[model samples]
Target: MKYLPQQDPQVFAAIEQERKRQHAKIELIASENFVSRAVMEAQGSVLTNKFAEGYPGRRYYGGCEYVDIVEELARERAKQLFGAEHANVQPHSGAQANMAVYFTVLEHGDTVLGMNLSHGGHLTHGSPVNFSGVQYNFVAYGVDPETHVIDYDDVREKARLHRPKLIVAAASAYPRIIDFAKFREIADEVGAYLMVDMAHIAGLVAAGLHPNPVPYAHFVTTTTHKTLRGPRGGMILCQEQFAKQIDKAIFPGIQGGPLMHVIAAKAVAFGEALQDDFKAYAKRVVDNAKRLASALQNEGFTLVSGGTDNHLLLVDLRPQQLTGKTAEKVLDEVGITVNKNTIPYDPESPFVTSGIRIGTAAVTTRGFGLEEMDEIAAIIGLVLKNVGSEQALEEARQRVAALTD
Candidate 1:
């Protein structure tokens, strides 16, 4: 920061403003969290200067000894934390991690099964616009319309009908526990490779709050941020037999070099996840989620699937007759941050949906507990229900400021 402030005032000013903005606003985004300052230090290190193009002890470049140690720590910690036989800590983003897994197991134009995007699936899972969908034939399994849950029966049906090469489990906005055992059974029935994208639930899985997918899935991909509370990056975990293929798919097939500094930060996060306190934090995240869900229900907001068993929930805004886009904008005016999201069987378009996705991880990281969850729910209610009233927005803003304070 010292050199940054002196060398580039413009960029430094924007970064400082962003830092202040993060502190001032309520971050309710499900896929976001605040990492510890130690993580920041690691990510900002001079390791960025190196180009470690290959694995430890055997790299495409010379001068990789120190980076080799950093990456080894990352891989070993990831394997230990996830109970996996092998770990690839190289993919720069979750999309890339997923892509590597696909590239390793799937041939071009192969059939694959994934969750429906509007029903809580990520774009990489099979959005027609994305490369995964463009290259492979992706069949989608949606959640049950009335219950808003993934129906194993439908999953089996899809797998049987399509005979996919792979079946993807897990989601971006699902609010309940995904049964990986059932997914494995379905995958086995169809003779498909099982891959679980536990990007959103990685921290919960690590803390044993959520079921570990390592034993069931052939490949598991996750982001280092979100509930893991680390630098923004991705990782892939797999069994021993596929380790070399996965690594080759990541390096020679896709990327050029690994982000060593971010890998260092990921190692720091893995170390933190190995601690007892991370479990406590994970518990609080879920606890705050449920409390917030209940509070919102009490305030007459309908939540998807009735409630949450994890860090996030989707509030169905239909009862209030509000679009997710409108609610999101109004909530921002009140200093509360959230994202417009699609609910199961959503009648509206993705751009103007009938739900808002909210999460407790970032707020819990800021030390807000059940009491604050109540306040947040009430503030969301105030802003959404009284959209045009400047007075109501002002009051909500003050409440938000007090919470951050």
Candidate 2:
């Protein structure tokens, strides 16, 4: 008889069942992972009771003693993890972090150069529907029409033509290594500040499995949950000179008291990321992604950008005569989770996108490797092939259980 937090036995049973379900399935969502038990414990720590309204060593609260150490450790670990001059691990999510940065640098109605939303960029980057677009004048740049790759040349051309006050470099779905140095050059040419949203690939970058953008960008923003394998929270890294402005924007400007518990978990995740084994894990993430990309291609699926140089890939479903929504349903039914994504230059609307985006980060976190990626790809292909066939999906689900078991 173990002690349970929830008083209701049914509720406790459901929570345990869900945990087991997550353990049983192969989670392939691009921006999801199973945080370490240490991270989990930190998230459920006593720090959650604190209401420290200010930064480390300068909290507004009177009895802010130990929380200062926790917050400072989180900040230091983040700075070390990303090789930045300053790090703020306070914001609750990536969107809030971006909002803080945006408020600090840009005035309302100021022009901003950002990647197009449907072209693999995040909503905060500049979707017309988002506050980023509604509040500011956003000029978007897209990938090459034919190659399905970011045309940095086009980005530079747009920056030069618009002479925007700020330029944002980030992606949610574009499948290639970003050139931060080139982005820096473009920003310099236009006399604009460059902000890179590396939310999707921060873990890969930390492990040296991907390129680091800290040296080139004026500011960088990321979430701890994705790829980083930590609790749900956001962090902002910037040049030391801009630290005060960034902090003000995040605190009084956008949010109030920070999530101290999540910050504790971030500290733990950063400590784990510093280890040599974490680097190897990150490298395996990339390797497994490549294997999955190759496997899907072999099964006659077309991967956007030809293939992936990172953890996720976008698959065009038109060739298979399946809509992105339909493929997503088929995969989920077979114990595989994926998101419907809009391909660059998509002919269909965002709601019924022409592509699906899949990733290897979660499975990699779960201790699955290259061999599992190949098998997972086969399962996806088989499910898609039998799109509406219940028997086919059931068989695929059984195989998935067998593989994971």
Candidate 3:
């Protein structure tokens, strides 16, 4: 960035500010993580200059020999990491990966059964405004109101009634383990294709911290950046039978030239995940999440589902008599970053959700342990308890500064 500061001072300043902000704050966003410097170097490498318009060895454009190696390495590493029959590392985003799957398998107006948005599903899983919902008929299933967990019986009942062409087993804010085998059984019972978007839990899956969905689902899609700790990109894994269809859907069907540099960075990240240290890191992430959840509960913060089994916790702020928007703002001011989310059966609008989603992945990457998690919980309790008090806010800020420093 030495030359960047001289050539583009405005952009350089913004980048510097973001760097300072990240270094000075505690990030708890469930869907965010910091990538390694190696990953960043790969993303900023000379591979970005290439235009690889197709798969390795089959590109329509020329001058792709080295890029071909990069893509092939990424594909092989991804397949090896997840034990999938095939891998496509060119979707650019998780949503695009999903779109490619839909295009490959289903026609317009095909019925698909998916988790409900307010109950922890992604927008692509049938939010009415997304391309998926507008193009196909999507039936929604939600978690059990009391347990705040997915009910297999409810999912089976919905499948029996709707008989959708596809059944999506995934979530954006769910905290418990997803039983992909159970979902497979339901999909088999209904004669539907099963797809799992493991975007938020990719690293856990790679590290064997969470159940792997590759064997159970016909297709698995994930973003490389979240728990995977890669550059921002998406990939798809599928059985050998649908390899051609999936490849075509992603290449000439939905996307143009692939980002070779990001794919290179993804390859680097995948290699890192294969190491023993990453497994240890993933275990600590879950441990920290559990500890934080316990601390928050002890401080009278109600967590959705009563606790968590993965890297994130959905905290219902209604128990504190606070809105998610207000809590997000207050926490941001105090140097803790988290996003407001909609809890199961939330009575509030999407604009003002009743819950805040928190994760330990980023902090755990920064080497935070149980003690730090407890301190974070205490800070949250203090700040929210005195939402309008400047003195309390200042105190929380100082505590956060101590931790970051």
Candidate 4:
């Protein structure tokens, strides 16, 4: 028999309301995913009570034997998933994972090369507000204006000239496949340690939908929840040569206690990804993104790069006579959730950027395919075409609601 929530109506009611909220909207955010019920169970398990401050077999606390199993399983699974020589499943978030990697290889005030923030790079790469930029001598590279794609030659030139001690090849809004091997070559030319931040495409890489960076970079950092569909957490992977340093950086150097519950959930997600079904799911995610991008392009929207090779794309919103901030708000009201993003050489400010970044992972997980993507693209087209029209917006809302249910 169940407790029926008669003993805790408030808690039960809040849970139900949150579920209702999720059901009401379509999540298209590139950096988010809906985890499995098993993953959720693991997240909400008793393992959360434990404070395992260190790695398995080397903890600062007692009663960590079972928690050790959880952490080890996560580490092993991550190693297998990414073909990493060694894995650390302790960083609290992607940012922490990056911090650990940076501390492992770079001294304070060391020179580093990374992607420009406005040109698809994450804040962690080198935004002045972030620690990576504040503590290091940071130089940036961006995409080509005509192609709207990363100019490897530009990256090479920047690295050759700056001769940084470290190079981070990663993105938050890039829509094409990253050439990790090329980046590795460039890093070698400059004698810089390379770290690939694959947080955006880890699942795609795991499922073989994208090229693997494990073979090229000295270290890699990723979040489990984005495309991996686990609890919100981060993991670091490195070659055997850098293993000890990375582990130390992740432990005493950066984070303290690890989230055992999230690690358990990551193990579950990794198990799920190992299945044949996940590969098919990953392929579908790419297909949905391409289909949507094509539709948007057909509708006369200026898509960055002209298309995509992964789950995300940047739509230049200025040409459509709208601001990214306004477009995000209008679409949010109708159920589609996209983040305002900065296009390469963006003329607008970050808050009112010239682009809207869209992704297909969450909707694809919800069983949306080409037809569904077509409908979504059409709906977005209709809403954008109508702009501030109340009648048109309501119609789009009805269409989105009907599809979500």
Candidate 5:
């Protein structure tokens, strides 16, 4: 950092501003979290200089002995944390991890069943613009309109009708616990391979707060940076049988070189997740989310799914005649950060959605408890209720300043 500051003042200043922004704002983005300084240290290490083009003891390049140790530690730690028979910690992102799984099993034009995007699913879960949808024939299943929960019977019907080659069980904005066992049943009934992208709830699963998909799915993929609080990368967990295929698909198939430094950071974070304190942290994350949901409900905001069972909540903003886009902007003005997200079966378009997504993972990592969450919810209520009033917005800004200070 010292050398960088001396060499590139502009970039250094921007980094400093970003650090200040993180310290000053409340982060509620469901898919984001604060990595420990230890994790950051590993990510900024000299291991970044290496080019480990293959798995441990199988690299094509020379001078990979040390990086091999790093990658092996990451792989082993990930396997231990998730109770998986195998781990591949090389995919650059969750999309790549899923793409590798598709590459491993399905050929082009093979049928795949997945959750619908507007109904709390990720893009890689078969959004048409993503490669998964382009290469594979994707059929979408979604939550029920009345319950806002996955309609397992509907999913079964789709699986039976499509007879897909693969069945993907995952979501990005879902609040309740997923029934991975039920998904396994449907996959089994259809003779399809089951894959789960548990990127959002990996920490809860690791801490035993959520059902672990490892014991139920053929392939499980996750991002390290979400609730997991690791480096920004992806890992795949699978049974011993698919280990070789998964690795082969990731290396020399899709990606060329692994990020050795990020792998080291992931190992450090996985080691942290194994500790008792992280279990408590995961518990508090859910607790804070529930608290915030209750507080927002009391303030007249309707929650998708009625409430949350995990780290995030999707809040329908229609009661206040507020668009998700406007709510996001007003909240940002008050030093609170959130993202506009589409509610299940939302009547509005993606850009002008009817809901905002909020999570407690980052704030819980920042040591925010139930009381702080209540305050955050109150702040959000105030800002959104007074979106066009400068006086109220100024008052909200002052309150946020007091909290951040």
Candidate 6:
């Protein structure tokens, strides 16, 4: 009776397998989460048929009245959720949102200061392979080696030295709260624009668990998925004065034809985030993360920053002398999922890292609590500590099945 199965059995089966995989494994990937049924329904709706070529009431295409309402709902809800003066729900992904900001502000080859990728920055911030790096002269700031926290003084030093046109704040893998106020201070000192990519911590920020970037940053970009637990799409929140430029950068400068359906889904997700229960859910996510961090420490694993103040923590695998690739592979074998990530000042390459980045957002969304986190940590300890033993692996596998199945 399923429409997908009736229309195309092959594609439907692949999706079915993914659903089963989601069911069978503990999803620890820091950037992944499951959305609600309402969000899913909105994404899979008929709004996909409309091609809203521009912002509400200013579209190039006809028949956008209904889609305009949806877009306005999303834009207004995002502004309300993030406390920004304006919101643009059009950029297709976080990368595109960043690209749009860069397009709007920076000229080609202008100086930009951002977090070092190995130190928790996203690729779009300034990876050489990415367009952001290729187009702009990007400078990087690193975390304090011992504390694994941002070196705010170094950020000021780098800004003073580089005199960048833009100072990029926030990170993809950092497990601590960022001082947006300090970042803004440094940006003001350097006479630079401040942009915060809050893609990783947007949900916590919304729930008042983390500091909001809208007031301190000139622009804030985020994905609707991950801790926000919505559809996979990007958004930009900016001041009212910069709203027109931000919108133009998104439509004409970087991307075109907004995904009306995904925006509808984002509206639904923002609605859920506004509810009191979502604040409780976000708090539980942080609690589960802290529990998992302590439990992993008991397993002899070292966390990059000692512990987390948010929903994710980075585990340094050097103590066990295991490459993150091997750890990721073996953990997948045990039915637990995590990604190999480069720790700060990593000795190895990005592909074969010395760390694993784990988050509680996905498993927490799946209703995992502190006890489940401890058990997951224990299973991880067993699998990573005894990588070559068939019996140990089978035992760990059984434990994982007990948790999931």
Candidate 4 C-alpha lDDT tens digits along 81-165? 8889999988889999999999988888999999988989999998888998999889998899989888999999999999999
TM-score of each: 0.99, 0.97, 0.99, 0.97, 0.99, 0.99
Cα lDDT tens digits for candidate 3, 43-80: 98988888889899999999888899989889999999
C-alpha root-mean-square deviation, candidate 3: 0.8
Candidate 3 lDDT:
0.94
Q: Candidate 1 vs candidate 2: which has greater lDDT?
A: 1
How much is the lDDT of residue 191 in candidate 1? Answer: 95
Highest lDDT scorer: 1
True-structure RMSD, every candidate: 0.7, 1.4, 0.8, 1.6, 0.9, 0.8
Residue 125, model 3, lDDT: 92
Off by over 4 Å in 5: none
lDDT of 6 by residue, 1-405 (tens): 269888999999899899999999889999999999999899889988998787898999999999999889998889899889999999899999999999999999999999999999999999899999999999999999999999999999999999999999989999999999999999999899999999999999999999999999999999999899999999999999999999999988788888899999999999999999999999999999999999999998999989999999999999999999999999988888999999998999999999999999999988899999999999999999999998999999999889886
Q: Encode model 1's per-residue lDDT on 177-251: one tens digit a residue.
A: 999999999999989999999999999999999999999999999999999998999999999999999999999
Q: Which ranges in model 2 have alpha carbons more than 4 Å from their true place?
A: 1-6
Worst 10 residues of 4 by lDDT: 1-10
Tens digits of lDDT, candidate 2, 34-128: 88889988988888899999988888887778889998998898888888999999999999999999999999999999998889889998878
Which regions of candidate 3 are displaced past 4 Å?
Answer: none
Question: Candidate 3: minimum summed lDDT over ten consecutive residues — where?
Answer: 317-326
User: Which candidate model has the greater TM-score, 4 or 6?
Assistant: 6
Q: State the displacement of the C-alpha of residue 29, model 3, in Å, after optimal TM-score superposition.
A: 0.7
